[PDB]
Symmetry: C5
Subunit: 98 residues, 5 copies
Amino acid sequence: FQGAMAMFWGLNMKPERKYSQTIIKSFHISGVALDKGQEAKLYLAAEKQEYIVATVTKAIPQVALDLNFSKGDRIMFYTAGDASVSLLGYLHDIDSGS
Amino acid sequence: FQGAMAMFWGLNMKPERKYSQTIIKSFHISGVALDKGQEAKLYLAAEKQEYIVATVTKAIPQVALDLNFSKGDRIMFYTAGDASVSLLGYLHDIDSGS
Amino acid sequence: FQGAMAMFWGLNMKPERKYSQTIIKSFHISGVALDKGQEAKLYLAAEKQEYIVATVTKAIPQVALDLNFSKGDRIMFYTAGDASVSLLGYLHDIDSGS
Amino acid sequence: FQGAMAMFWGLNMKPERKYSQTIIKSFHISGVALDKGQEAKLYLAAEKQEYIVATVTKAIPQVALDLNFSKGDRIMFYTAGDASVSLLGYLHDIDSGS
Amino acid sequence: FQGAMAMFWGLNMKPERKYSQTIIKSFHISGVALDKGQEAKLYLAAEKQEYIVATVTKAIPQVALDLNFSKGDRIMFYTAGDASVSLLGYLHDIDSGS
């Protein structure tokens, strides 16, 4: 099937949602942006630490950011404020045989 | 022929066009920008989910974004508002033999 | 000689120049910026399609963009407006033997 | 376990903290941003040289930057001003057997 | 020692300095930013051509840019104006045996 490696990923956030989600496939998030919304602060709690990964508002309607996770950790993605943001990314499954 | 891997890709959007297109070659989109136009909201419906990937306007005449798709999914690219945007990217066909 | 893979590339554009150039070495353009100039719209005609890859002006004196081409296509790079822009990039010659 | 290669990394800075830390795992920092804070200047002293890697303020509430370190050097990360910034990155452990 | 590949690199520029330097190790520059300074125009003369790679000022206190050089060329890095800028990057020594 040749090397695809990176397959499309997406995450639609609703105003003040918190998704504590485990990772079965390592992936990279590449952007978070709002179409409908006033303010969305994109927080990530991983390693039991609250990381502020992006602040995407009407003023900054799109935060293109380099995010990457591995299937070893269990992270929580949550947005504060009132806005609905769509994240985009790609699952990275790099294979080189053995 | 050596490793090219990433070959050039481009997509010219017209004001309020919706292209529901299948993927036979995995590719990365790297930028969406408008030359002629007032506003273009670049939406992507993949996995049956409306993702707002970029908002490119006269105010933000160019959104350089990290987009990547695989030949497994069937996505729809569509712009809202009135503007004509040109996306640019590269088809990633990484080969490492077997 | 070890793996260099990506070797330096550069392109100095003069106000309203059009270079229809073939590709013998696949390369990535990573930025277009103006030092002297008022406005430069960086267009790329490839696949016989006019792509607006960047709009770099005095207001936006530098457009860092992810561009990539392969030695299979023959593209034309041309800037509109009055400004002299310097593009920067790197030829990607990835080798992995056979 | 397949190729994960890049595993998630994060760094929460407090206003005017200096962490002189050794590297046992090579990693890339991809963003530094403030949620709470007025100003944070992100300095890095490596090779016994003070590098100003990013200036992230209330005005620029998020600096997405391409940082990369190797397990050979011993660096110091320190922020000046009053703000608490969260850095995000990923440890790059690329393996290709032998 | 596993694959480090990319090792940390940095370059502190003083107001109006010109470093004509040869490359013994291929590297990528990822950002140029000023902490102390009014204006720094980051020029690169390579292939005997003056490239304006970034314009980093008090207004634009940090230019995150994708720069890459190979150990084959001999380049000159020089900043104009009055400001002291710190560049950051990583030497890319990709090895895959033979």
